[PDB]
Design a protein around this ligand. Structure first.
Ligand SMILES: O=c1ccn([C@@H]2O[C@H](COP(=O)(O)NP(=O)(O)OP(=O)(O)O)[C@@H](O)[C@H]2O)c(=O)[nH]1
Ligand SMILES: [Mg+2]
Ligand SMILES: [Mg+2]
Ligand code: NA
Length: 325
DNA sequence: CGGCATACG
DNA sequence: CGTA
DNA sequence: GCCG
């Protein structure tokens, strides 16, 4: 079991679901308290369990697994012994966890904003609504549409959205392409949003594309909210006899950078963080969604594929459905 | 102990 | 600050 | 919280 998540296949469904979900509760809680280091360790330990070929049944099976020290092991131990971990349950019940979770789930609200509101005594969504003076227009959108946005996006939702995005993209720039990314590209059956990557086979033609796409989407009455090369929108998605609000992210990249952007936006989030960490610390190369940079030779690696990028980094290729760290 | 991904809106 |  |  290698120490970086990008070094091992991590399937979407696995054999330690309960254990990983408990550790991810502690990761989340760590983030609510600003402790990014602890969040990372708990996320990594959870991911290690996702990568195992069978259930963890005894404590000794944790020996020699990366990212399992005294704390994470004790969490697993209690779950194995009693089916629950007191620390985890304590977090679950806490007013702090529940309110920070509720608040950060709002589009436009991050840990810093949630925390401030919490300290001001705010607890509920109606607490925010009954004082819209303090809200940004983004937060007002997030709050108005919160119920719909809390509803899982389904695969059938995605196909319908892709068609309408392709339609607008097609008028905006003939020959431009739309690629499904994010969680659904990794095989997820549900999602919190739909993520699309847009490019054109002729380098440079993609310049200026996103405002033209956005203009045409808005013209068809499909945009409930939007604010460039990235756009975080709320779409009006038809439903039987009605509609619902759905979060949709659009990203444009030149075709030269397409593999890097495909890699970066397909995730998982932890997978990308680990991959970038691996790149910098183990290979001395700087990776982002634009490219891979050798800071010694002052050169960018050209990639024609995600496979190229894994090869560059000396990693075995992992298809998207094995990047579910 | 230092480090913990990386960028755009 | 928010977002991915 | 854990690695190196
Ligand atoms: O902090 C972040 C967030 C997101 N991302 C990258 O953006 C992708 C989409 O970001 P996302 O927030 O849409 N997450 P996703 O994996 O689609 O799952 P879901 O919650 O169902 O939407 C992720 O899969 C990562 O590649 C990051 O690199 N960093
Ligand atoms: Mg997504
Ligand atoms: Mg997204
Ligand atoms: Na939020």
């Amino acid at each position: 079991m290698p120490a970086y998540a990008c070094q091992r296949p991590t399937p979407l469904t696995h054999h330690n679901t309960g254990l990983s979900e408990a550790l991810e509760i502690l990761a989340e809680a760590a983030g609510f308290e600003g402790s990014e280091g602890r969040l990372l360790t708990f996320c990594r330990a959870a991911s290690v369990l996702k990568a195992l070929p069978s259930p963890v049944t005894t404590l000794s099976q944790l020996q020699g697994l990366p990212h399992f020290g005294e704390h994470s092991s004790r969490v697993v131990q209690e779950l194995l012994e009693h089916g629950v971990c007191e620390e985890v349950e304590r977090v679950r019940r806490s007013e702090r966890y529940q309110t920070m979770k509720l608040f950060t789930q709002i589009f436009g609200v991050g840990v810093k904003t949630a925390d401030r509101w919490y300290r001001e005594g705010l607890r509920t969504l109606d607490d925010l609504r009954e004082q819209p003076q303090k809200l940004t227009q983004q937060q007002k959108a997030g709050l108005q549409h919160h119920q719909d946005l809390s509803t899982p996006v389904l695969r059938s939702d995605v196909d319908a959205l892709q068609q309408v995005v392709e339609e607008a993209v097609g008028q905006a720039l003939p020959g431009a392409t739309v690629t499904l990314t994010g969680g659904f590209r990794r095989g997820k059956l549900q999602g919190h949003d739909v993520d699309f990557l847009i490019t054109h086979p002729k380098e440079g033609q993609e310049a200026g594309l996103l405002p033209r796409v956005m203009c045409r989407l808005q013209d068809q009455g499909l945009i409930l909210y939007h604010q460039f090369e990235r756009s975080f929108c709320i779409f009006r998605l038809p439903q039987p006899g009605s509609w619902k609000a759905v979060r949709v992210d659009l990203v444009v990249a030149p075709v030269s950078q397409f593999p890097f952007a495909l890699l970066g936006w397909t995730g998982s989030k932890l997978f990308q963080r680990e991959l970038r960490r691996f790149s910098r610390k183990e290979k001395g190369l700087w990776l982002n969604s634009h490219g891979l940079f050798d800071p010694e030779q002052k050169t960018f690696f050209q990639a024609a594929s995600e496979e190229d990028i894994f090869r560059h980094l000396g990693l075995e290729y992992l298809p998207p459905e094995q990047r579910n760290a």
